[PDB]
Amino acid sequence: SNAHITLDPDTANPWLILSEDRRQVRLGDTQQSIPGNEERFDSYPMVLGAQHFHSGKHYWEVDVTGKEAWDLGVCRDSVRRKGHFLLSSKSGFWTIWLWNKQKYEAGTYPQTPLHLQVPPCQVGIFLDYEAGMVSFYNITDHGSLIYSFSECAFTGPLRPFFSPGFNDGGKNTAPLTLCPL
C-alpha cells in the first residue's frame, strides 16, 4: 500500500533544510538555530517521516538523482536521537546507503556491499510489518530488488528514515525528494 510520507520537522538535525511541503530535504551550508527537543537528531544529518507504522504494508519512493551520498530506510521509533550510533539492523535500523558516490551498502552489522548494475535515480522502500521485512527496489532498473531485510523482529512502531548526506564538503546540495505515488 502506497503511503504518503511527509518529514517530521521535530526530528530533523540542525544541518538540514526541509521544503515547505515536507516532501524534500537537503544538506545545508551551516547549522540552523532551533530547539533541542528530545526527538531531534543532534549528532548526524538525519530526519524521520511523520508517519508511524504499527502494522500493515507501506510503500514509498525517493528520488536520489545526482546525489553522491544518502541513506534511506526505516527505524524503530524508540531509537536514541541523542549522540553517536551506527545504522545497523542490530540497533533499530533497516537502511541502505550510498557512500562516496560509488559504494552502495546495506545496514547489516557489518554492512553488506551491493553491486548494482543500474545506479538508482529512484528507490522504493517496502515495509511489511507482519512479515518482518523491509525491501529496497531499484526503480530505474524496473523494480529489481536492491536488498531485503527479513526476520526483523518488529516491536512497537516504525518510521521512515532519511539522510541526504553527512558533510557539505562536496556538493551534496541536491535534495532527497519523495515522489508522487
Ligand SMILES: CCOc1cc(Cl)ccc1-n1c(CN2CCNCC2)nc2ccc(F)cc2c1=O
Ligand atoms: C560507509 C561509511 O559508514 C560510516 C561512515 C561514518 Cl563517517 C560514520 C559511520 C559509518 N557507519 C554507519 C553509518 N554511516 C553509514 C553510511 N552513511 C552514513 C552513515 N553505519 C555502519 C553500519 C555497520 C557497520 F559495520 C559500519 C557502519 C559505519 O561505519
